[PDB]
Design a protein around this ligand. Structure first.
Ligand SMILES: NC(=O)c1ccc[n+]([C@@H]2O[C@H](COP(=O)([O-])OP(=O)(O)OC[C@H]3O[C@@H](n4cnc5c(N)ncnc54)[C@H](O)[C@@H]3O)[C@@H](O)[C@H]2O)c1
Ligand SMILES: NC(=O)c1ccc[n+]([C@@H]2O[C@H](COP(=O)([O-])OP(=O)(O)OC[C@H]3O[C@@H](n4cnc5c(N)ncnc54)[C@H](O)[C@@H]3O)[C@@H](O)[C@H]2O)c1
Ligand SMILES: Nc1ncnc2c1ncn2[C@@H]1O[C@H](CSCC[C@H](N)C(=O)O)[C@@H](O)[C@H]1O
Ligand SMILES: [Mg+2]
Ligand SMILES: [Zn+2]
Lengths: 255, 470, 343, 255, 255, 255
RNA sequence: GGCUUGUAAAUAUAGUUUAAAAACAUCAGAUUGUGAAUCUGACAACAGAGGCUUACCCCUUAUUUACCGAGAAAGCCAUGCAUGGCUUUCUCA
């Protein structure tokens, strides 16, 4: 089981991170929802219960993440799991000849800063925090799970920056897994497909229905509870390391 | 090398150092001046002051190396009071002495009355390390000088037990001291000594011979006549004409050698390796089946003599020449030799084979054991032909007496090829028919002493003997 | 004057001995006595160590003759002298490194490699892991090569130590090769002297070595027809390295010559034998035809890597042979003229 | 939960299949160890309990698999999960220039038949019975979990046939997932690394120890219970479909 | 340069193999079109010229491949390049619930025997002759290229057997490359997408035209000459080894 | 052939970019070595003749890249090929427990800025430049090639940032290929292994020997001319699009 | 193709060379910030065994090189016409 574990969930105030926090807290673990101050995460943390605490921090800022980890240590005394679910998406074609429009560098830089650079910042700071944990019977000190996208493998038109960030996460998953092997920290990556989160539910019902039809089976948008269950399974299994799991429902994104 | 024998008054030694350190290697003085000393026996009285100021410089302590060197000097110059004082020095300085320190101590201590202290010191050096032959000689000389015949004999037996070859000077001094006192047990010991000398084959010197004559004449029970004699062509004896030993061996000793070789071929691991046991037993059965053979012929030893001559040609020539003497012929063949080659001609090979039986062996097989066993089985009458010195085989022999008898057999029963020209004719080397070893017959004795001046080489033997008669 | 001087200082020595002996003395096993004995050798100046261990003292005690003890003491002294010299050299090198490091510290130039490094400096670990992977592959597909440690009976302690050292060197050379052999340690008794020494020398790596060690004889593991036992006494001269055969090397350092032991065992087991073609390719001059295990394994590796005899035999010590036969193409001319003779 | 499910486990008499059967039966599910007659699976079936049965069948034989599935339906009347864990391993270099040895074709044929052809035969036959099941509330009719190897991506020397079979399994994973998507059957593949099962008995013990030491973390051979746990996680998750999961401990096989 | 090289092309009497033979023979190389007796490859061999010969052989048969290689050696004396283009395609759903139709095992076994088993048979048999060649500057003794398909990565519905065979080829690409690395033989794989050859004429014309329209760029069926150009580029480059190249035109096949 | 084509090579003053410039210019093309002001590229441009020009520009800065492209257009009038070879390498462990040293964030940021952000900046600007080209008979307006690394797949210890950047390039390859497909611009990526460029030749002799021994075959560091030949082959082939080619000699970098 | 005893002499570096102790080397542990070009450990036996004292000899094994055929003449010496020994010449295989 996961009773007694302490998990730091980035972007845990909404979507996949929130579902993971709910599942883990229901199991019995303790959760630290690390999110932006203007995210409404305080209400969620209050709703979950005493085992859950909200940390206002920006993953792109070293000081903010350090303060969040210090708060987590003070509240619970240790960190056992870290789920990197914070990220943003921007849709923009690389270059549209008809409109004579070019992808702005600012959008690409922002997407890289949030999705990729922030994830690495959290990974390194959490590894530093978890290095203090006493190894368990199996020698494991903690687990780090990252969220990627199938865009890392099959990206669509206008997903240049998003696909770049997710592919960077996928590439860095294994080198870090080798880096932290002597420490005893497992690194895994989940590549969700399409999920019914605010990032997608905001879209008109027509495109949502079309996307639900696209998935081979089940012909529906992914349920965040499924992502939380996969995260829990990764946490429980002591042998999954340095691998990307496509939680996509067999969908291969068309151009 | 300005070396005075006068006291080394302090100031002088100052200059003794300056312009001297570099003069001699290995720190010169304290290491080399002592060696330079020991000349004329006046160097002792001055080396005393040397050591005196050496200790003065020291914090009232003397280097052990310097002490042992002083021991060597004084004992070499025979200062018994100095030996006594230095023995006290060892006692009061070190619980244990040092190798060759014990030697010098005992060499000095012989002249004192404390012989038993020498015995204790010998036992002491024994507890940890094996003492030396010189130590044994020194201590036995002291003990005999102290009239302790029983202990001297016991320590001689101890020496023999440790299996160290004794020094001839030992036994010479033994006889010299015995001169004064006559005893039946003492005479028995002397006879045992002489028998051991015969067994070990060593020859004594002129001083030893003089001791022998003095003792043997001094025996009161029987009057004896002693005289130095010549070999005289192997003539029995230059004076009094007693038959002089032999080249041939007696049948009983021949038989004991046969038994020794049998018990050796049984349970011989190295013999098995060099000569496979199956081949050994096959050869034994071969010889048993065939009758005794008068002569044994060396393998390829004759053939490879005179390299130009074809091996088969020379072998056929020699075997035919011997067969014309109508004796029984044995030849030691080799398995390789069986195969046809330029050197080996099958027609000659089969002619010699039908002429006389043969045995074949592989390369690893050693001829010497086969030849020796064949000769021993044949008996005293047979002879062997070869040129190898048999050094490898005579090695690893069990007993020194067995080695001596093996050497005697090797000299005997041998007819070395001497014809300078094979095609011209065939000739066999003559037999001297004697050796150089004490024989000690009844009512008379003869010893092959060597005159001290000549430097006899390893293969040389003394020319003049000593004879005792009546 | 001087006579009183040395008598009086000797009385002082007596007093020194008595005051030294005033202390309580306990029972001492014989070896302890020998310490003083050995110390006396040191005082004279003979080639004896400053300090010795109890086990080394015992080993000296088992020596049978005086010479053997003298040789052992000289060995120990040489070992101690070498150790001291190496320690002093290491101290000097450390001082040199310290002064050089401070000198470098003075400049503080920085701007090194543009801080542009593709790899971390973890090369030794990577080499070890690569050699491990290659050895793992060889253990499944490598060509067998057998060291039969059935010679413990014929070897003394010194020979055992030398044999173990040569085995370590040979294993290292094979491990660091492009196409490593698959090494079988055959006829290795678990509690035997060779096995004990190997375990003491390899430490924990003994269980991690990628070589097969077994008490069973080589004949029990491979077909009798595929075994060639390399011995210098064989009447058959090796011509070409064969990849379908299993070569057996006798792990035997016979400093005391015992010719034919390896050949004797091969004949007893009824196995084929071969010898290196040294005389055919080198002007031997002066030396011993029997080479060390490391040289043998290096020669075999060179041959297995398609190297010619000239390249393979380069590992034979140069001091033995003056040099290779100038061409050996004269032998080829003899071959071709004789071939014409048949035709 | 998995209580009440019926699972057909090929090669369930030993190793990973036996571990999966043990785990599933311990959770209350019913199991049908489909294995060779001489594999001694009847003893394991008796040990597991009444909920587990033994089916003597050769996956490469259509008649044998049909008989096994008929027996499973007779005993339980439903097939919900199909775990293809039956296979063999062969070590043989493609060609050995030094030894003049060429890889035998019959070895390749046998390895393909047992590993690749047998797996597809089991899939196609079991999908027939899983099609009779009434679709669940989520529309699911059953799950098929294949066993592959990391050799499908990174096969070391002397692994041509095994790597070919596992690569074929990996390749046909997604097409079959799309074929059965309309009828609500999920197809997933697991690519274990090194596990402590009799399959490794062929290799020398020292080789196995070295390979285990070469796993980044945990530095040890995989425990079959871990594979069973991953299989259960796949079964529980309704959104994992048409994917290969590398349960290898982050090990990458060098030549 | 490919002047004087000897190439053995399997299935060289049509499509990609014929295009490769045409390109190579046009630059001084020698070609041995290894194909079925009824493929009518003798006409193509006669057309190409004296530098090309026809070998009637079935890749699935060891004796036929041995005879073809012996003929090639007798005619030219060397074998520098091997190109495995022989193969067949079968379209059949794994299971059709509405029709109650199950994929036949015979079709699957035949597809694996031709596409996969035949390729490995040719590889192992030709490595023997390529081992006789003395290494050139750089140590290369020869090159082997195999024709996989994008189906090995994203296979369509009713493509289980084809995808299995091509995925097996992809998986065994690297193990064989490691096996033959000491010998000095480079092994590469090409995964063509949609190329205009007889293999497509089985598909209805409208479907083929639609698929051509779906290639991102160029929006047309691949030209066999383009595959031949890629093969020549692989041959010339002495560093491409154990890698799969997707000569697909950026298409990602949808379900 | 490539006669008349105009190529913009980023980081063309050294290593792979310089080798590509030499090969293309020698074939009659025109090159614009885009590199840093103090990289010594002016000497290389002078050495390569009148058909090669030097552009001092930092890929991370939009203004400098725009100036370089304007200079290229002024000198030659058009841009036909782009080769992104500019990049830097940084080695640093994510976290060192023994030393308590955490990976610096500025190192990660700058590695992303140079390797990933700069590549995308060049891609977008050069695509805008190529959009004005008149499509050829095949409808192609230009080609873009990127230099990824094998690290992106199996990055070793301490290659977190480098692996992240290269994986981002790999992931964004296909989305950009789909973005520019309507325009008619092919996008390809090359993943070199170990090559004898200043990035490696500066290492000690023992390290170079070990790395050469690591490659299965050919057992030597890749020659930059080989990379240039592969680039030319990609340019000539009108069908290689949206794919990553591993030009690594079958190597798989160790942990 | 000419491959097997024996006698004599000279040598013997057990990872390799040099000298009469050094360099390159070897094994184990160091997740090394790029001089690890290092740190902590392991082995250090001048063919093998006996003695000699302060530096040398006896024996054994191995390697290499020589040694052997005959006729006479010329310059002689010794032993009982024959034998033994040295120096040069050509001759026969
Ligand atoms: N939605 C999908 O189907 C899908 C698919 C593939 C991948 N993803 C990835 O899954 C993750 C979860 O997204 P989601 O679907 O839950 O949408 P979401 O918008 O609900 O999740 C994003 C969360 O990240 C937080 N966040 C953003 N920037 C942050 C920053 N700088 N510091 C701290 N917190 C920050 C937001 O406040 C929010 O809580 C994202 O990384 C997304 O890219 C989503
Ligand atoms: N060298 C290898 O073995 C290897 C292996 C795989 C991948 N790569 C990648 O291949 C590419 C080729 O580089 P290389 O190996 O020739 O090394 P290199 O350093 O010789 O080449 C890099 C070039 O990029 C230029 N450059 C660097 N930063 C720049 C910037 N901000 N703006 C403009 N130019 C800039 C440099 O001046 C240099 O000319 C690099 O991206 C490298 O990471 C190299
Ligand atoms: N010249 C040579 N020819 C063949 N093998 C040799 C050799 N020199 C050494 N060896 C091998 O190296 C091993 C150590 S040498 C020990 C030799 C010992 N006389 C014996 O009986 O073998 C030998 O056993 C043999 O296996
Ligand atoms: Mg002899
Ligand atoms: Zn008389």
């Amino acid at each position: 089981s996961v009773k007694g574990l302490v998990a730091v969930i980035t972007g845990g105030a909404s979507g996949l991170g929130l579902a993971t926090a709910e599942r883990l807290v229901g199991q019995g673990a303790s959760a630290v929802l690390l999110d932006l101050p203007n995210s409404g995460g305080e209400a969620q943390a209050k709703k979950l219960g005493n085992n859950c605490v909200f940390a206002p921090a920006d993953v792109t800022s070293e000081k903010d993440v350090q303060t969040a980890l210090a708060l987590a240590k003070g509240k619970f005394g240790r960190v056992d799991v870290a789920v990197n679910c914070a990220g943003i998406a921007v849709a923009s074609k690389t270059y549209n000849l008809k409109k004579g429009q070019t992808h702005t560098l600012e959008d690409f830089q922002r997407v890289l800063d949030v999705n990729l650079m922030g994830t690495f910042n959290v990974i390194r700071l959490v590894a530093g925090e978890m290095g203090q944990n006493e190894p368990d019977q199996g020698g494991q000190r903690g687990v780090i799970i990252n969220t990627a996208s199938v865009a890392a493998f099959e990206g669509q038109v206008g997903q240049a920056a998003y696909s770049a960030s997710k592919g960077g996460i996928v590439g860095m998953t294994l080198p870090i897994a080798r880096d932290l092997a002597p420490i005893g920290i497992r690194v895994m990556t989940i590549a969700p497909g399409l999920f019914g989160t605010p990032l997608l539910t905001s879209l008109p019902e027509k495109v949502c229905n079309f996307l639900a039809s696209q998935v081979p089976f089940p012909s529906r948008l992914g349920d965040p509870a499924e992502y939380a269950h996969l995260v829990q399974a990764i946490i429980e299994n002591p042998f999954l390391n340095g691998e990307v799991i496509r939680l996509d429902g067999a969908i291969r994104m068309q151009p | 090398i300005q070396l005075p024998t006068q006291p080394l008054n302090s100031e002088e030694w100052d200059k003794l150092k300056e312009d001297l350190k570099e003069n001699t290697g290995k720190t010169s003085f304290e290491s080399w001046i002592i060696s330079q000393m020991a000349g004329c026996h006046s160097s002792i009285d001055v080396a005393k002051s040397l050591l005196a100021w050496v200790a003065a410089k020291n914090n009232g302590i003397v280097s052990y190396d310097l002490l042992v060197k002083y021991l060597y000097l004084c004992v070499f110059h025979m200062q018994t009071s100095e030996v006594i004082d230095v023995f006290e020095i060892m006692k009061a300085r070190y619980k244990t002495l040092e190798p060759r320190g014990y030697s010098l101590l005992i060499r000095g201590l012989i002249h004192s009355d404390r012989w038993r202290e020498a015995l204790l010191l010998l036992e002491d050096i024994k507890k940890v390390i094996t003492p030396s032959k010189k130590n044994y000689n020194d201590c036995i000389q002291g003990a005999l000088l102290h009239q302790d015949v029983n202990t001297a004999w016991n320590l001689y037996q101890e020496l023999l037990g440790h299996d160290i070859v004794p020094m001839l000077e030992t036994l010479k001094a033994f006889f010299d001291f015995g001169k004064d006192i006559k005893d039946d047990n003492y005479s028995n010991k002397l006879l045992d000594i002489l028998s051991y000398l015969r067994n070990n084959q060593l020859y004594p010197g002129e001083s030893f011979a003089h001791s022998i004559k003095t003792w043997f004449e001094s025996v009161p029970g029987k009057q004896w006549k002693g005289q130095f004699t010549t070999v005289r062509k192997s003539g029995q004896c230059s004076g009094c004409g007693k038959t002089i030993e032999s080249i041939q061996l007696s049948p009983e000793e021949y038989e004991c050698l046969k038994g020794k070789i049998m018990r050796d071929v049984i349970d011989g691991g190295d013999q098995y390796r060099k000569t496979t046991p199956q081949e050994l037993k096959r050869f034994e059965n071969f010889i048993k089946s065939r009758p005794p053979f008068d002569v044994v012929i060396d393998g390829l030893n004759v053939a490879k003599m005179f390299p130009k001559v074809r091996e088969s040609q020379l072998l056929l020539n020699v075997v035919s020449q011997l067969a014309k003497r109508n004796l029984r012929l044995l030849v030691l063949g080799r398995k390789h030799m069986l195969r046809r080659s330029s050197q080996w001609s099958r027609d000659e090979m089969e002619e010699v084979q039908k002429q006389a039986s043969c045995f074949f062996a592989d390369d690893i097989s050693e001829d010497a054991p086969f030849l020796l066993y064949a000769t021993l089985h044949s008996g005293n009458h047979c002879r062997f032909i070869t040129r190898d010195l048999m050094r490898d085989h005579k090695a690893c022999l069990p007993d020194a007496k067995t080695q001596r008898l093996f050497f005697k057999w090797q000299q005997g029963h041998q007819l070395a090829i001497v014809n300078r020209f094979p095609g011209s004719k065939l000739t066999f080397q003559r037999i001297l028919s004697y050796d150089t070893v004490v024989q000690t017959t009844g009512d008379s004795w003869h010893i092959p002493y060597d005159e001290d001046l000549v430097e006899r080489c390893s293969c040389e033997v003394p020319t003049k003997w000593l004879c005792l008669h009546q | 004057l001087e006579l009183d001087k040395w008598k009086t200082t000797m009385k002082s020595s007596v007093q020194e001995e008595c005051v030294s002996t005033i202390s309580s003395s306990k029972d001492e096993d014989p070896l302890a006595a020998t310490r003083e004995f050995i110390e006396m050798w040191r005082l004279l100046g003979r080639e004896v160590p400053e300090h010795i261990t109890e086990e080394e003292l015992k080993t000296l005690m088992e020596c049978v003759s005086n010479t053997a003890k003298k040789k052992y003491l000289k060995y120990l002294y040489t070992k101690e002298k070498v150790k001291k010299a190496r320690q002093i050299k290491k101290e000097m090198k450390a001082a040199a490194r310290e002064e050089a490091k401070n000198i470098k510290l003075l400049e503080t130039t920085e701007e090194d490699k543009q801080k542009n490094f593709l790899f971390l400096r973890l090369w030794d670990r990577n080499m070890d892991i690569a050699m491990g992977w290659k050895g793992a592959q060889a253990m499944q597909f490598g060509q067998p090569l057998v060291f039969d440690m059935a010679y413990e009976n014929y070897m003394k302690r010194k020979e055992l130590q030398n044999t173990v050292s040569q085995l370590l060197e040979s294993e290292g050379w094979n491990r660091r090769n492009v196409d490593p052999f698959h090494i079988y340690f055959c006829n290795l008794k678990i509690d035997g002297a060779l096995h004990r020494e190997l375990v003491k020398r390899y430490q924990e790596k003994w269980d991690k070595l990628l070589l097969t060690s077994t008490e069973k004889s080589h004949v029990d593991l491979f077909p009798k027809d595929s075994i060639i036992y390399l011995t210098a006494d064989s009447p058959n001269v090796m011509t070409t390295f064969r990849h379908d055969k299993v070569y057996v090397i006798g792990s035997f350092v016979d400093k005391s010559m015992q010719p034919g032991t390896s050949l004797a065992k091969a004949k007893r087991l009824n196995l084929a034998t071969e010898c290196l073609p040294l005389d055919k390719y080198l002007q031997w001059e002066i030396g011993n035809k029997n080479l060390t295990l490391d040289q043998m394994i290096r020669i075999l590796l060179c041959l297995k890597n398609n190297g010619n005899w000239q390249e393979a035999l380069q590992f034979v010590p140069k001091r033995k042979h003056t040099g290779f036969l100038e061409i050996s193409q004269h032998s080829q001319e003899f071959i071709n003229r004789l071939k014409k003779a048949k035709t």
